[PDB]
Design a protein around this ligand. Structure first.
Ligand SMILES: COc1ccc(OCCCCCCn2ccnc2)c(Cl)c1
Lengths: 236, 273, 255, 40, 236, 59, 40
């Protein structure tokens, strides 16, 4: 008989442990694995695939239309859309990125925001996208917007433009749930010159917008998502 | 590892930021393709986002309850919670489901942890000390009929004996007929015109039968069982879109009617911040 | 002078040419291949009809109009009646296959509109009834007709609400599945190569569909002034590397 | 040290440290180079 | 004194464990082993010995007669017997194979079904046995039957015919307790030409039928058999 | 047609033994080419020699 | 590691991995070859 002493914590059950436990049904024998395409190893692998952002959130019931950012022909100087960058809330929240970020407490890294244009091929347009780093207000006019991170996008044969929100930060991690100290800025978009439709054409054209994370990205300290809850256990 | 390299002014014919998303690719664009950057290192590995880590902590998967009381004159033990089942799931308690359903196919060893606590809601002189028995009476296995049937001999059938207030742990390999468990299944068990749909067809693995071994004392004792499940040795294939609407049933994808808009409406314009 | 843009796919006795492609997607970066022995279970030698089943079948055409919500086809169902592919299907106990899907929609440089073409492995549909109502067989086996998401709820059928992918997930996130867009201004076809994806090495072709192909208008069709307000969309699909096993009497399936 | 005979009874697995998003982010048939035109 | 911590599960009794326990009566001394013919090591060794199937189940109390499949002289085209292949139920259930399969939850593998003919030596017959893989109905006529796995048996000097039901399956394991998704097919038998008795002879002749498992076979996940139960403990 | 128009046609060859196809479904099950009208103005379909007998009569 | 002195006190035995059905499936005195006639 070897002398032992038990410490504080004996008998506790910590749902975040990784120890051994006996095998209820020994000498069993699993079924062999066959090959299946698509294996995922890290959630970091999947948040780099871009998905659509319901940017046009202004509706009243969920609709395919809140994915469409409208553009008006012949407007000059004006603003196309605006949003803050609380990736865990608001427009971002239902996107795959938003949806995964919510399983973690802290995030750090660059984001990739792209816009794909869908107007007739014989039209043309020049837009400016601007990222405003924390510390200033959402820009109120392009002059204000153009003094921060921006890209003049020229609509052409190449249909999409990929803007990166480079990680601009004092503190090396931000909270995924919106927090002030930790806030990330604003994203706005304005006409640089203006949309022009060809003859025989009319109305609004739309941009689709996507979001995905750069390879830069870090997420840490897992927790429970506000995105799902329940009141009684389900049954069959 | 560098998180960003140093990059300076650019005036090229080589534009990495113009792409065609119609192709289905997400081109790997970085901050340094469109602003001037400085070197910085990652200092991070992505350890805690590994799927083994993501699915590897214990989650509550089931709460049931049984009572110790005089069975004298009870015509239906099962019905008096003199014992009680649990049609093995993992999709009843939605918190771990969304997690799991982020994947199509998924393979993982298992580690079950059962906590049992007792309650004595009405006048008792004391708290008795009960031993719970937990058993696996699967497909072919004689189901318990009374709380003290021959079934409970369970001599070929695994079964646990632990004390109420304590905890019963153990683990299990992948006992799923195929190479992975289907998180989803767009099929039927056969080409029948009325047979059921979903995965409720596949997820066949009998139920768990709990009972108190003790005979009855003078008062009644409620024992409530909580089953926790931790995946170990995880393997997951084919990522899918996360669950947006609420769940209604074990094993079907169905959402409730007149549900509410899941996308938050802006308080303001598209232009609003 | 090769462009990403022009392409030719010859499979069996049938060829497709596109002069306005946008590359092609190969699901999960894997190309269809036959079933290796190391992965095999059934001891039966399989049958590989080759060129008589691995050719291009063009399903009947759809009509995109400003009110369209989107269409959904299931595989191998959509092909249950095409030539010898279909016969083999009803006659063997088990079968396995990959596909090349080519979705076509041409317009002019004055039109606008953008379709999402996506392949979803194991697309289990939801009942519009809620609760645990099931979706009857016939409803998930529309055949070449596919399911029309702008048709009415029917009884025993699935829900046809587009912002929810017919299953409780948001349209916006379908992009995690192999997919390609058809943006009239860019593109005129979409091509996806689908490797066989299952948790078993070979399965039944009638009780289980292993992918749904979905074509969904996202930016509404907008025709030039006084143009007819609609465009046809055509889907052509070719089984590839098909194998059938466990031949016998010939399945009888509901309806 | 494993104290038990069966593999299911061992603790959690250890980090894939695999990580390759290209099956998801770039499943295109003809390779796309960043910087070269998307559609030629 | 070495510091320890006890984990969840301490003190539990799992009837499926394999740990050490003290020896109640030490320094004992067992009796030597002598040699005994017949040692069994695996249940897989014994399920390969064939045993008779009470195929003729149509009686009302157990009788030697339900082991006998009758044959009629001069019938043409017709069907001799039919059964599904739920090895854990129905005809199979009392056979040694059926009886062991019931101690396990899953089975996979090939089955060997043989028929031994017992009619007068001067008679003759040609039968067809057909295996119908899952997915079709039990065949309704030989035409239907002959399109699946089959053997034309010619009754001769060699008295028995061994048909194999080769493992035809998507899923690599089936349930021993009958389940749909997991179902294995049907087995039928028909006259190929017809039984012919010699002169001076009359009546029915019978076939005996056996079942055993091929070396192919796998059984896993032990459990309790529905084949035995009790209401009070027995005594001497 | 004008350069700013577009069209997709299917040409089908039906080998001896069946009737002239009556609808595209019927037509598409034999030798066929989906032609996409583009910059490249012509499409060349080949009627590959499908035959039991190695020569046919010109009349 | 055995902690106890007696052999009865050790854990379960380890798989025969013996397996030879012929004493049960083919106890015939003159050897039968599959494919050759049963009765000559
Ligand atoms: C109490 O002793 C036991 C002895 C053996 C057992 O095995 C349980 C196997 C069930 C695994 C369920 C995993 N799953 C189910 C559906 N999806 C995932 C159990 Cl649960 C308990």
């Amino acid at each position: 008989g070897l002398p032992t002493t038990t410490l504080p914590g004996s008998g506790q059950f910590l749902t975040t442990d990784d120890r051994q436990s006996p095998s209820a049904l020994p000498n069993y024998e699993p079924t062999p694995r066959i090959h299946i395409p698509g294996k995922v190893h890290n959630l970091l692998e999947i948040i780099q695939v871009d998905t659509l952002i319901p940017m046009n959130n202004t509706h009243t019931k969920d609709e395919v239309n809140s994915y469409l950012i409208p553009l008006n022909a012949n407007r000059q100087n004006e603003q196309v859309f605006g949003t803050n960058l609380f990736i865990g809330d608001g427009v971002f929240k239902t996107t795959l990125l938003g949806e995964i970020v919510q399983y973690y407490t802290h995030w750090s890294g660059s984001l990739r925001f792209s816009l794909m244009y869908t107007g007739p091929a014989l039209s043309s347009a020049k837009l400016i996208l601007a990222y405003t780093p924390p510390g200033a207000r959402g820009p109120q006019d392009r002059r204000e917007a153009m003094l921060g991170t921006h890209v003049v996008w020229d609509i052409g044969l190449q249909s999409t433009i990929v803007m990166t929100i480079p990680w601009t930060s004092g503190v090396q991690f931000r909270y995924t749930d919106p927090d002030t100290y930790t806030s990330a800025g604003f994203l706005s978009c304005w006409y640089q010159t203006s949309l022009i439709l060809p003859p025989e054409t009319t109305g609004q054209v739309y941009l689709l917008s996507f979001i995905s994370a750069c390879p830069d990205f870090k997420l840490r300290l897992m927790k429970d998502t506000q995105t799902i809850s329940q009141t009684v256990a389900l049954t069959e | 590892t560098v998180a960003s390299i140093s990059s300076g002014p650019k005036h090229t014919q080589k534009v990495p930021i113009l792409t065609a998303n119609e192709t289905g690719a997400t081109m790997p664009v970085l901050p340094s393709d469109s602003i001037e950057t400085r070197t910085t290192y990652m200092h991070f590995n992505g350890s805690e986002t590994d799927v083994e880590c993501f699915l590897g902590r214990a989650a509550c998967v089931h709460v049931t309850e049984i009572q110790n009381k005089d069975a004298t004159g009870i015509d239906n033990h099962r019905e008096a919670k003199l014992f009680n089942d649990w049609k093995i799931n993992l999709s009843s308690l939605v918190q771990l489901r969304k997690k799991l359903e982020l994947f199509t196919y998924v393979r993982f060893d298992s580690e079950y942890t059962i906590l049992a606590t007792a309650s004595q809601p009405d006048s008792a002189n004391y708290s008795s000390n009960l031993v719970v028995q937990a058993m696996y009476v699967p497909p072919g296995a004689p189901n318990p009929k009374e709380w003290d049937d021959y079934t409970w001999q369970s001599a070929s059938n695994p079964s646990v004996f632990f004390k109420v207030g304590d905890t019963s742990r153990f683990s299990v390999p992948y006992v799923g007929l195929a190479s992975a468990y289907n998180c989803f299944y767009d099929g039927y068990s056969h080409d029948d015109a009325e047979t059921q749909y979903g995965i409720t067809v596949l997820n066949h693995m009998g139920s768990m039968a709990f009972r108190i071994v003790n005979e009855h004392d003078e008062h009644k004792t409620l024992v409530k069982i909580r089953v926790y499940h931790r995946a170990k040795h995880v393997e997951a294939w084919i990522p899918r879109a996360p669950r947006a609407l609420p769940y209604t049933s074990i094993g079907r994808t169905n959402y409730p009617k007149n549900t509410e808009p899941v996308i938050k409406k802006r308080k303001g314009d598209i232009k609003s911040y | 002078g090769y462009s990403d843009r022009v392409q030719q796919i010859t499979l069996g006795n049938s060829t497709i040419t596109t002069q306005e492609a946008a590359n092609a997607v190969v699901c999960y970066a894997e190309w269809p291949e036959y079933l290796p022995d190391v992965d095999a279970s059934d001891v039966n030698k399989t049958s590989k009809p080759d060129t008589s089943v691995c050719r291009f079948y063009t399903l009947d055409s759809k009509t995109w109009t400003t009110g369209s919500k989107g269409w959904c086809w299931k595989l191998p169902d959509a092909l249950k009646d095409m030539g010898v592919f279909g016969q083999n299907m009803f006659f063997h106990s088990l079968g396995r296959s990959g596909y090349t899907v080519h979705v076509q929609c041409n317009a002019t440089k004055f039109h606008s509109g953008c379709l999402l073409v996506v392949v979803i492995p194991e697309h289990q549909l939801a009942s519009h009834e809620g609760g645990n109502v099931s979706v009857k067989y016939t409803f998930t086996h529309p055949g070449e007709r596919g399911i029309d998401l702008s048709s009415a709820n029917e009884v025993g059928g699935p829900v046809k609400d587009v912002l929810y992918n017919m299953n409780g997930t948001l349209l916006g996130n379908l992009l995690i599945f192999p997919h390609q867009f058809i943006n009239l201004r860019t593109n005129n076809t979409a091509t996806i190569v689908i490797p066989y994806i299952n948790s078993v090495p070979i399965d039944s072709m009638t009780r289980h569909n292993n992918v749904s192909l979905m074509v969904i208008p996202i930016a509404p069709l907008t025709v030039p002034t006084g143009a007819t307000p609609s465009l046809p969309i055509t889907v052509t699909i070719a089984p590839m590397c098909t194998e059938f096993s466990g031949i016998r009497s010939k399945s009888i399936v509901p309806q | 040290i494993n104290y038990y005979k069966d593999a299911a009874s061992t603790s959690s697995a250890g980090q894939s440290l695999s990580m390759d998003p290209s099956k998801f982010t770039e499943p295109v048939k003809d390779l796309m180079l960043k910087g070269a035109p998307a559609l030629n």
